[PDB]
Amino acid sequence: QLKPPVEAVRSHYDKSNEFFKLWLDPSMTYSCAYFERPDMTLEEAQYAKRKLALDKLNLEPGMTLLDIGCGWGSTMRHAVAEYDVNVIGLTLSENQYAHDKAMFDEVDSPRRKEVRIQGWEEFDEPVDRIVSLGAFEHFADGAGDAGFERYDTFFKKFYNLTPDDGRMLLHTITIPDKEEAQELGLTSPMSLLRFIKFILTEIFPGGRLPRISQVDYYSSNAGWKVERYHRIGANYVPTLNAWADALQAHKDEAIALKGQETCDIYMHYLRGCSDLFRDKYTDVCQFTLVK
Amino acid sequence: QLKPPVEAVRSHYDKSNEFFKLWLDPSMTYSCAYFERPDMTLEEAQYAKRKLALDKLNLEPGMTLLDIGCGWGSTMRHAVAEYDVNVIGLTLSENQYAHDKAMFDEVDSPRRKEVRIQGWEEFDEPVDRIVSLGAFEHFADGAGDAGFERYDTFFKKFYNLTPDDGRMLLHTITIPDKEEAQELGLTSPMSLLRFIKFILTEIFPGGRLPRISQVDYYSSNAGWKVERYHRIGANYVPTLNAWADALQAHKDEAIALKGQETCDIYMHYLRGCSDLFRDKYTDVCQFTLVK
Numbered sequence: 001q002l003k004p005p006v007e008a009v010r011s012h013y014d015k016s017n018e019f020f021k022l023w024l025d026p027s028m029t030y031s032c033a034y035f036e037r038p039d040m041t042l043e044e045a046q047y048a049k050r051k052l053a054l055d056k057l058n059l060e061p062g063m064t065l066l067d068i069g070c071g072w073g074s075t076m077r078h079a080v081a082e083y084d085v086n087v088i089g090l091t092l093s094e095n096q097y098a099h100d101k102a103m104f105d106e107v108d109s110p111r112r113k114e115v116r117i118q119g120w121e122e123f124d125e126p127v128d129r130i131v132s133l134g135a136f137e138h139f140a141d142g143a144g145d146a147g148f149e150r151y152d153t154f155f156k157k158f159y160n161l162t163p164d165d166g167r168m169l170l171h172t173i174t175i176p177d178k179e180e181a182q183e184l185g186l187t188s189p190m191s192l193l194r195f196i197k198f199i200l201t202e203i204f205p206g207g208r209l210p211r212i213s214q215v216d217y218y219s220s221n222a223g224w225k226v227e228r229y230h231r232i233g234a235n236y237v238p239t240l241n242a243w244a245d246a247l248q249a250h251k252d253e254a255i256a257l258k259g260q261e262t263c264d265i266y267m268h269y270l271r272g273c274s275d276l277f278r279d280k281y282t283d284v285c286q287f288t289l290v291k
Numbered sequence: 292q293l294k295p296p297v298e299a300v301r302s303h304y305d306k307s308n309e310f311f312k313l314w315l316d317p318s319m320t321y322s323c324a325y326f327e328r329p330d331m332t333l334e335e336a337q338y339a340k341r342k343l344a345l346d347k348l349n350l351e352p353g354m355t356l357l358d359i360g361c362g363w364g365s366t367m368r369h370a371v372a373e374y375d376v377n378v379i380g381l382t383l384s385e386n387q388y389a390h391d392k393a394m395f396d397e398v399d400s401p402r403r404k405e406v407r408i409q410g411w412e413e414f415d416e417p418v419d420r421i422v423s424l425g426a427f428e429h430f431a432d433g434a435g436d437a438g439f440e441r442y443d444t445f446f447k448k449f450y451n452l453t454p455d456d457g458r459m460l461l462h463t464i465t466i467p468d469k470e471e472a473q474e475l476g477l478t479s480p481m482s483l484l485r486f487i488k489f490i491l492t493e494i495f496p497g498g499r500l501p502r503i504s505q506v507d508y509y510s511s512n513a514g515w516k517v518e519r520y521h522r523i524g525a526n527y528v529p530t531l532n533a534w535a536d537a538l539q540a541h542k543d544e545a546i547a548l549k550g551q552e553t554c555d556i557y558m559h560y561l562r563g564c565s566d567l568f569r570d571k572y573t574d575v576c577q578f579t580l581v582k
């Protein structure tokens with residue numbers, strides 16, 4: 001069976017918790033926010049995003065929630081606080097794991113709070129609901145076994161680990177399908193091609209963005225149905241600008257911490273990606289998957 | 292002023308003359324062929340391509356021809372033989388220079404035969420005609436001063452080094468303009484994006500493909516007029532398949548020579564690029580530039 005893209009993932013997310021601390025919001029949510037109201041700060045928007053997702057799971061207290069690619073815990077920690085469920089978080093980052101583990105010590109609840117350095121490929125317990133925010137772009141990747149063919153194992157797996165009322169909220173960056181790209185009038189100048197290369201080179205090695213039809217094909221092949229396609233990628237512009245701005249604001253702390261080049265790399269990364277979503281070149285979609 | 296992309300260029304073209312010898316035609320022409328007649332071998336097609344270009348220069352004997360990015364000499368060596376002009380060749384490859392230099396010893400003529408390790412940025416003599424086949428994609432590159440803004444220096448320079456009847460045959464891979472890409476129905480799946488990244492990573496670091504309108508803008512800004520746009524990119528499929536096939540044919544010699552990975556890399560490179568032109572994602576154009 002499958003090998004998790006450990007080293008690829010670690011090269012990014014294990015860059016330094018203090019480094020990310022500088023420019024992420026306070027909840028350290030590392031995925032597209034949700035400006036449900038025009039006046040939310042970034043941090044309130046991250047809450048709104050977490051909420052928005054968790055609400056779709058029809059969670060009841062006592063249930064077990066699996067969070068795949070649980071980042072820095074915000075989603076788990078929020079799922080317990082606001083829903084009273086037990087949570088299991090999957091991550092491949094040592095830093096993220098270290099931090100979620102400690103962040104758990106703080107607040108208390110009769111609910112289970114587990115973070116693991118485990119891949120979805122290796123998970124094998126029964127759960128009630130599933131959430132994954134901004135991790136999916138790594139699932140087509142593997143320790144030398146990459147391929148969208150992997151989505152197939154994925155959806156069939158977690159269809160089988162969940163009850164008959166089982167639900168999955170898959171939140172992920174996407175790219176337009178043939179028909180829709182044409183319809184958008186999308187075009188790929190040389191600057192853009194250089195950028196993606198830069199991204200796949202300096203930021204997210206082995207990352208693969210799905211087309212909605214890919215998520216359909218493999219999900220339904222497993223028996224899933226999409227109760228909703230919530231396209232919300234426009235929110236990534238405010239998000240990404242916020243991150244970029246904060247990083248710039250801490251330019252001197254950041255150069256002090258992980259170096260000159262990295263400020264440049266990440267500023268370039270953050271500024272650049274903003275435009276991708278501005279231009280509708282990329283999107284973010286939240287699939288509500290049911291049986 | 293400008294610094295030539297020496298190390299970027301050397302990383303590719305200085306891979307090994309024996310290595311390229313294995314799969315290039317016998318003239319070792321490293322650019323899109325021209326199957327002027329359906330039955331030409333690759334080698335005859337390279338001649339047809341060289342001819343096709345040189346014919347546009349209205350060369351007379353005694354004239355001086357500058358070949359920019361003269362590759363492995365085929366164009367120079369052909370320009371003397373069939374036109375009786377003196378030739379200067381510019382290259383940044385040590386291997387290419389070594390080889391053209393020796394290849395010159397062989398055949399003889401009262402005509403000057405010069406190959407130099409010099410950039411177009413550094414050239415400063417007067418010439419009658421100018422040819423450049425498959426080098427142009429490196430002109431927007433520089434030793435830390437890349438940018439299409441460079442084309443401006445280029446065209447203004449060689450407008451000034453040539454007489455009033457001066458002509459330039461610019462032969463280069465291109466990419467579609469906005470309007471035309473849309474019209475072609477072009478689309479950039481993830482596989483394609485991964486590929487370009489692979490290309491700009493493992494094959495042609497810093498390479499930049501022009502849009503026809505870019506060549507127009509900068510050329511005319513210098514005073515040039517395009518007497519013809521000869522689009523001939525479809526020929527690159529036969530060319531690239533030929534190269535790929537030959538390399539495969541010599542798989543064992545090649546693995547013996549520069550290693551396992553490199554056979555893989557270059558097979559992947561060659562096979563892959565073929566499709567780019569098959570799909571009209573990229574093109575090849577020959578600009579006849581006049582005053």
Ligand SMILES: CCCCCCCCNCCCCCCCC
Pocket residue numbers: 030031032133134135137138173199200204207208209273
């Ligand atoms: C080529 C795509 C690489 C895979 C995407 C990994 C993003 C994982 N989410 C957390 C970070 C989101 C940063 C925004 C990415 C925008 C492009």
Ligand SMILES: CCCCCCCCNCCCCCCCC
Pocket residue numbers: 321322323424425426428429464490491495498499500564
């Ligand atoms: C991203 C583009 C890189 C710059 C192009 C350099 C090609 C210089 N010609 C000689 C080699 C031609 C090989 C075919 C290239 C097809 C893509």
